[PDB]
Amino acid sequence: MRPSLSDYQHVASGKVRELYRVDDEHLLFVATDRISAFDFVLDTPIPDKGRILTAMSVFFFGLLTVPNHLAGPPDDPRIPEEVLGRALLVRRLDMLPVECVARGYLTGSGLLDYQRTGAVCGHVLPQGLGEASRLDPPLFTPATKADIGEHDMNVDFAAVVGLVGAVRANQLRDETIKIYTRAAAHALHKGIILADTKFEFGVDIEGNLVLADEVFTPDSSRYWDAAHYQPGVVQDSFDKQFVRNWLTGPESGWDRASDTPPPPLPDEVAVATRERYIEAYERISGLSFSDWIGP
Secondary structure, eight states: OOOOGGGSEEEEEOSSEEEEEEETTEEEEEEOSOOEETTEEOSSOOTTHHHHHHHHHHHHHHHSOSOBOBOSOTTOTTSOGGGTTSEEEEEOOEEOSOBEEEEEEEOHHHHHHHHHHSEETTEEOOTTOOTTEEEEEEEEOOEEOOSTTSOOEEOOHHHHHHHHOHHHHHHHHHHHHHHHHHHHHHHHHTTEEEEEEEEOEEEOTTSOEEEOSOOSOTTTEEEEEGGGOOTTSOOOOTTTHHHHHHHTSTTSOOOGGGOOOOOOOOHHHHHHHHHHHHHHHHHHHSSOGGGSOOO
């Protein structure tokens, strides 16, 4: 009753997720409890973070109408007991080499590019925008993965055409904006702003576009509390602000500008952070995390 994880072949690790081969046409997509802050994977895990983000991704896959890479239910017998609730059975796709990012608000590298050049990913914007400015319409701001440990590189629409084809590039742009708009409106209705989001897509055997990776997690998207949205200043991270504040506060003993690895988190900060994840999940999904499956 359920295989061991050791029965599958590890094929890729990210900082936070792992991928295993199940057979020629299926993979096991595993979320860990690791958390990243200031581009460091922290020493301290967040309990149940992997299960909560898996629950979130499954919810949004269900909410969206577009084809996705899920290949079975969250309790599929192919999933080992050890990763139950934080692993998904998915179909193998030919992945497209584009980070498909939508921005509803101007922050991070999008804001920085604008402040440097007046444009973001080929979009020449109005003068006078700033931190957390609302963008209307939302922008397609594609990026490509760089070297290990390097940030993704922002690129323009012509670069996407060169990567995947002219018609496919149009399709990626249209789908990215459409599904971001739907999910952002849903979340905002529940009091959470999805400020931006990153998608990865693949193509199936028939040439069909399929949404893959994870969707609208607080790792793939900037979550903000709508009740405190204030254009012109930096918005708190809904999920990670307790972690960021402790690390840069007087108790950590850590100098962020040293680029030395940060120290472990207090247990109470890790537990509070877990609670923020559960809060975001339950408010967005209308479901109870106590009903989500586990070992």
